[PDB]
């Protein structure tokens, strides 16, 4: 991922960190298999709900993520209080 540590984290290192393939280099670190699957799945959830509030006007640019956002967040929160509680 070609990333270097930060004191305060700028949003740019947040855009490199948030991507799935960034979660790939870390997925290799965690020995546990189902954990490895869990946080990966979490991150894909996050990629699905991020453009809603990131994008300028989701009503056109990204409609399907918007309509599914409630359900998607439900799923997310469930996964957190499940394995990460």
């Amino acid at each position: 991922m070609k990333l270097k540590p930060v004191m305060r984290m700028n949003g740019n290192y947040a855009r490199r960190l948030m991507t799935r393939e960034a979660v790939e280099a870390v997925c290799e670190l965690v020995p546990s298999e189902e954990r490895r699957e869990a946080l990966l799945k979490l991150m894909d959830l996050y990629l699905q709900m991020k453009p809603v509030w990131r994008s300028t006007c989701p009503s056109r640019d990204c409609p399907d993520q918007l309509c599914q956002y409630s359900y998607n967040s439900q799923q997310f929160a469930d996964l957190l209080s499940s394995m990460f509680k």
């Binding site: 070609k2 990333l3 490199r16």
Partner: protein, 285 residues
């Protein structure tokens, strides 16, 4: 019975195909007997003077300036200086260039690639030189430009890390270029002296102040590697004076002396590194 046609300067350059046929043929036929392929001048001498035939002068200034002296627009060296020395970003400069060109142009500034092409002369690894005697344990190749200062670190994992990035001129080349840049001031200094020309060419003495100092708190870039510390070290020199000795007696005789050595304007960077002053290792490497 034919056709009325309006005047030429309103038609497209294309529209022309019909009108110069005979002149293109006549200049072609002409070129072989008196030149052989010298296209520029035949057109130039008839035209300037043909204008000043039914003359108000106004044009003669603009036309006599037009080709060889100087600019017309602005000579690329003047452009280059007016970029480098007012601190214009390349993209910023080009931005301006586009603007001045599009609006009322008649563009003045020269485009980037012709600045770049006017560049190669000022940088080192250009001007030929030779050393008497030949330098010890140094390559004799004089064309070398900016060199990665790592200077052949084998970057084998097994060895000391190659971590530090650096760039440096080959010292001697940087010298001959910095100094030949002073050709103007050294010759004018010589003429102030009213000193002999052909005689006493070789008796010179050059005094170079070199300085190296560290700089901390320099952030770094995510990048592809290699990992490198924050702090940067800038190694630079400046030519303080240049003097003459021959025939003999006569002390040494100053010619050029830097008038304001503390200025930013005269300091010549040579080696640029990312190194902490504290680690001696990579510093001496």
């Amino acid at each position: 019975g034919g056709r009325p046609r309006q005047h030429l300067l309103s038609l497209t350059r294309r529209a022309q195909k019909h009108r110069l046929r005979d002149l293109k043929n006549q200049v072609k036929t002409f070129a072989e007997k008196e030149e052989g392929g010298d296209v520029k001048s035949v057109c130039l001498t008839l035209f300037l003077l043909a204008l000043r035939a039914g003359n108000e002068h106004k044009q003669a200034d603009e036309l006599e300036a037009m080709m060889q002296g100087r600019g017309f627009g602005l000579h690329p060296a003047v452009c280059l200086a007016i970029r480098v020395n007012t601190f214009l970003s390349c993209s910023q400069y080009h931005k301006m260039y586009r603007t001045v060109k599009a609006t009322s142009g008649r563009q003045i500034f020269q485009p980037l690639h012709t600045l770049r092409n006017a560049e190669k002369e000022l940088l080192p690894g250009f001007h030929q030189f030779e050393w008497q005697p030949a330098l010890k344990n140094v390559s004799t190749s004089w064309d070398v430009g900016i060199i990665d200062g790592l200077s052949g670190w084998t970057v084998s994992v097994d060895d000391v890390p190659a971590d530090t990035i650096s760039r440096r001129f080959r010292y001697d080349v940087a010298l001959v270029s910095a100094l030949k840049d002073l050709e103007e001031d050294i010759m004018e200094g010589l003429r102030e002296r009213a000193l002999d020309d052909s005689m006493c060419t070789s008796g010179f003495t050059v005094v170079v102040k070199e300085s190296c100092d560290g700089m901390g708190d320099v952030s770094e870039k995510h990048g592809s590697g290699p990992a490198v510390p924050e702090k940067a070290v800038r190694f630079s020199f400046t030519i303080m004076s240049i003097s003459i000795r021959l025939e003999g007696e006569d002390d040494g005789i100053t010619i050029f002396q830097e008038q304001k050595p503390n200025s930013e304007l005269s300091c010549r960077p040579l080696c640029l590194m990312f190194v902490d002053e504290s680690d001696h290792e990579t510093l001496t490497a």
